[PDB]
A paper describes a structure:
The outer mitochondrial membrane protein Fis1, known for its role in mitochondrial fission, has been reported to interact with the ER-resident protein Bap31. Fis1 is a single-pass integral membrane protein anchored in the OMM through its C-terminal transmembrane (TM) helix. Bap31, an alternative protein binding partner of Fis1, is an integral polytopic ER membrane protein. Fis1_ΔTM exhibited the six antiparallel α-helical repeat bundle structure known as the tetratricopeptide repeat (TPR)-like fold for protein binding.
The presence of both Fis1_ΔTM and Bap31_vDED in some crystals was confirmed by sodium dodecyl sulfate–polyacrylamide gel electrophoresis (SDS‒PAGE), and a crystal structure containing Fis1_ΔTM and Bap31_vDED (residues 168−233 + 234SAAA237; denoted as 168−233 + SAAA) was determined. The crystal structure contained three molecules of Fis1_ΔTM (chains A, B, and C) and four molecules of Bap31_vDED (two Bap31_vDED dimers, chains D−E and F−G) in an asymmetric unit. In the asymmetric unit of the crystal structure, two Fis1_ΔTM molecules (chains B and C) form a dimer with an extended α1 helix. Two individual coiled-coil (CC) dimers formed by four Bap31_vDED molecules (chains D−E and F−G) interact independently with two Fis1_ΔTM molecules (chains A and B) in the asymmetric unit. The remaining Fis1_ΔTM molecule (chain C) in the asymmetric unit did not interact with any Bap31_vDED molecule. The C-terminal region (from Asp224 to the C-terminal end) of the Bap31_vDED helix in the CC dimer bound to the convex side of Fis1_ΔTM, which consists mainly of α3 and α5 helices. The concave surface of Fis1 did not participate in the Fis1−Bap31 interaction. In particular, there is only one salt bridge and only one hydrogen bond between Fis1_ΔTM and Bap31_vDED: between the side chain of Lys64 (chain B, Fis1_ΔTM) and the side chain Asp224 (chain F, Bap31_vDED) form a salt bridge, and the side chain of Lys89 (chain B, Fis1_ΔTM) and the main chain carbonyl group of Ser234 (chain F, Ser234 is Gln234 in the wild type (WT) Bap31_vDED) form a hydrogen bond; when analyzed with chain B (Fis1_ΔTM) and chain F (Bap31_vDED). Since the buried surface area was only 273–361 Å2 (~3.4–5.3% and ~4.5% of the total surface areas of the Fis1_ΔTM and Bap31_vDED structures, respectively), the interaction between Fis1_ΔTM and BAP 31_vDED is likely very weak, explaining the impaired complex formation in the SEC experiment. Interestingly, although Fis1_ΔTM + Bap31_vDED crystals were grown under acidic conditions (pH 4.5), the C-terminus of Bap31_vDED had a defined helical structure.
Numbering used by the authors:
A (entry chain F): 170 to 235
B (entry chain G): 179 to 235
C (entry chain D): 169 to 233
D (entry chain E): 179 to 236
E (entry chain A): 1 to 120
F (entry chain C): 2 to 67, 69 to 102, 105 to 121
G (entry chain B): 2 to 120
Amino acid sequence: VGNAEVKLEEENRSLKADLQKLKDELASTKQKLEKAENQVLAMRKQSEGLTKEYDRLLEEHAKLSA
Amino acid sequence: EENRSLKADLQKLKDELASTKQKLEKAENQVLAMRKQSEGLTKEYDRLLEEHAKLSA
Amino acid sequence: DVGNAEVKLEEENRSLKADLQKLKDELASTKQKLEKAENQVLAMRKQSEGLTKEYDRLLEEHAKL
Amino acid sequence: EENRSLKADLQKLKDELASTKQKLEKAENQVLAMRKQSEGLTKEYDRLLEEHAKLSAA
Amino acid sequence: MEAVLNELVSVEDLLKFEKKFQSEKAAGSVSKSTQFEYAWCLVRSKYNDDIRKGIVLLEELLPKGSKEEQRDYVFYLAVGNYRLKEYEKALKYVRGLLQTEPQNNQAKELERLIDKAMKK
Amino acid sequence: EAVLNELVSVEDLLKFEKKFQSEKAAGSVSKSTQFEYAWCLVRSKYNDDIRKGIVLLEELLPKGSKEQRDYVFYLAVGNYRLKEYEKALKYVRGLLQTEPNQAKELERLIDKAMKKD
Amino acid sequence: EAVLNELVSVEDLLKFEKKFQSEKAAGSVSKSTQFEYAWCLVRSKYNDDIRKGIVLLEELLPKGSKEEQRDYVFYLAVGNYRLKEYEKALKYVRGLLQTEPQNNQAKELERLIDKAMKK
C-alpha cells in the first residue's frame, strides 16, 4: 500500500514537471510566431517601398531611352 | 474520474498540435515561395544593372 | 351481433374487388394511350428528318433563282 | 395484418400516382414547346410564300 | 499576271476540295470544316454557279454552327451575295454581323462596298 | 501618313469597343472608357460610328464633373461631321460661354458651312 | 475639314494636359488620363511631345492589364516610328505581333517602319 502511494507521488511530481515544460515550450513558440508576424509586416511595408522604387527606376530608364 | 478527463484533454491537445504542425509547414512553404520570388527579383535587377551600365558608357 | 358484421365484411370485400378491377382497367387505358403517343412522337421525328431535306432543297432552288 | 400490407401498398400507389401526374404535366410542357416551334415554322413559311409569290408576279 | 496564278490555284482548289467533300459525303456525314472549305473556295470562284453553291452550303451549315462559326458563315454569305450583285441579302448578312461585332473593320468595309454599289 | 492614321483609327475603334463590351459584361461601364470609345467614334469616318459616339457622349453628359465641357465640345464636333449644323452651333455656343477660349474656330467652321449651303 | 482636324488636335492637347496636371497635383494620376495624354503627345508634330508621350507610355506599361499593355506597346511602336526611332518601333511592333500574329494594323505599321528603314 505504502509502495503504491510512493509510486503515485513519484508519477505525480513527474506529471507536474512535464506540465511545466509544456507550458514553457508553448510560451516560447508563441513568442517566436508573433515576432515572425512582425517580421512579415515589416516585409510587406518594404514590398510597397519596392513598388515606389520600381516606379522611379522605370521612369528614369524611360527618360534615358528616349 | 479526473484521469479520464485528463486523457480526453490530452487527446484534444495532440490533435491541436498536429494541426499547428501542419500550419507551420505550410507557412514554411509559402515563405519558400516568397524567397524564390525575391531571388527572381534579384536576378532581374542584376540584368537591369548590366543594362544601365551599358547605357552609361 | 355476428350476422350484421359478416354482412358488412363481405360488403366491403366485394366493394374492394370492384375498385381494384376499375383501377386495373384505368391503368390499361392510360398505358395504351401513352404507347400510341410514343408512336406518334416517333413518326413526328421522322417527319422532322424529312423537313431538314425539304428546307435544303428549298434553299437550293431559291439560290438557283 | 395483410390489410396493413394493402394500406402500405396503397401509400406507395399514391406516391407513384403523384409521380405520374407530374409526368403528364412535364410531357405536356415538352409537347407545348414542340407546338410553338411548329407554329414558328408555319409563319416563316408563310412569309417565304409571300416572297416567292412576289418574285413570281414579276 | 497574278490573275493567271489566281485562276490556276482556283481550279486546283475547286477540284481537290470537291474531291474531299464528295469522299466525305459518300462515306457517311460530311464534316463541318470540309463543307466550309468547299463553300469558301466556291464563293471566291469566278463561276456564278460556284458562288451559288457556296452560299447554299453556308446556309446549310449555318444552323448547326457554334458561336464564332456562324459569324464567319454570315461574313462569307455577305461576301458571296455581294459578288452575285444580290446587294440586299449581302446587306442583311453584313448588318447582322456588324450588329454582333460593331468594329470588325472588314465587315464595315464590306458594308461600305455594298452601299456604294446599291446607289444607282 | 494616311495609312498610319487609318491603322491607328482602326486599332482604337476595335480595342475600345472590346474594352467597352468587357466592362459592360461585368457591371457598369467606366466613364473614362466610354468617353474614349465615343470620342474615337466621333473621330471615325463612318457616319454610324459618329451616331454611336454622339449617343455615348449624350449619355455621359448628365452625371458629369463640369468633364461636361469636353463632352459638349465633342458632341458639337460629332453633330458637325454629320452635317447637323444647328446642334453643332448650340453646343459650341454653350462651350464658348463656359470658356471666354477654344471652339471659336469650330464656330467659324459651322457658320461657313451653313453659309456654303 | 483639315481645319477641324487641327482644332480637335489642339483642343485634345490643351485640355488633356490640363487634366493630366489636375490629377498630378492631387495624388496619383489615373491611368486613363495619362494614356489619353500620351495618345495626344504621340500625335503632335513636335518631336519633344512624342518623346514625352513615349515616356508616359513606358511608365504606364507595368500598370496595364493584359490588353492594356498590348495597346501601350502598339502606341510605343507608333511613337518611335514617328520619331524615326525605327529600331524601337520595330522592336515593340514585333513584340506585339508575337502575341497577335494577324493584327493587320500592326502588320501595316511594321510595313511602314520597314519601308522607311529601307529608304
